[PDB]
Ligand SMILES: O=C(Nc1cccc(C(F)(F)F)c1)C1CCN(c2ncnc3[nH]cnc23)CC1
């Protein structure tokens with residue numbers, strides 16, 4: 001049996017740092033996967049007990065996450081606790097954030113947006129089946145692997161550096177009204193957020209923005225959707241079906257879940273079997289760019 005220790009990993013570079021802890025790119029230097037590169041998160045258990053909402057919740061989420069096998073969800077490989085720290089060993093993802101692609105491109109062609117949103121919808125469908133709600137599809141929460149395919153990566157504890165309960169840490173621009181109102185929610189919040197992300201991809205900004213936090217929340221709650229005249233009929237129709245205040249009435253909120261969204265005419269050109277098999281050419285290939 002292999003004894004996993006922090007000493008099994010050499011540190012290569014820092015990928016992130018915050019109040020809860022720190023993320024490293026690492027190389028495993030002993031055991032079966034000697035030489036393989038991973039992402040290693042190191043969380044301060046002392047900090048976790050302090051800043052929290054429900055550790056049982058986030059623990060259960062990571063418990064499920066560890067067992068998930070899906071091409072568009074991050075692989076949480078090992079998890080162990082020694083010292084006063086929690087170590088999470090994940091697959092290393094070299095393609096950067098979807099945020100970075102949007103920053104570069106300004107806005108996406110509809111075919112580009114369609115590709116990413118399609119892969120994301122399959123990840124969401126799988127998550128819901130396994131009992132996970134993603135909550136927040138801000139483009140920083142979606143990474144790309146070396147090929148340019150989506151990996152959902154933001155689970156469990158709040159990874160923000162500047163905090164605020166952790167609902168309002170970081171941008172709330174992609175989160176459903178009922179999360180912000182703390183009025184109770186379910187997987188329908190994910191289809192809202194997919195819509196907010198789609199809107200950002202196609203127009204350059206999330207749907208509801210304010211000069212400050214208070215005004216932004218007010219706009220999200222009012223949910224007065226402004227549909228740009230320059231987007232296709234299919235894009236506008238999907239957006240109006242996702243970005244609805246009535247959570248129950250969102251496309252995807254019914255019993256078919258992701259199947260409802262995937263059937264929409266906006267995705268008419270997607271071959272879902274090829275997409276899942278990652279046989280569809282991504283719009284952007286990190287290794288080549
Ligand atoms: O966790 C992160 N940031 C962060 C920021 C502050 C604090 C903390 C914490 F306390 F949790 F440790 C974490 C990001 C997660 C996604 N990232 C990955 N980068 C590369 N391979 C990856 N494989 C899986 N994820 C990635 C980049 C960083």
Ligand SMILES: [Zn+2]
Pocket residue numbers: 158159160162163164165166169
């Ligand atoms: Zn926080």
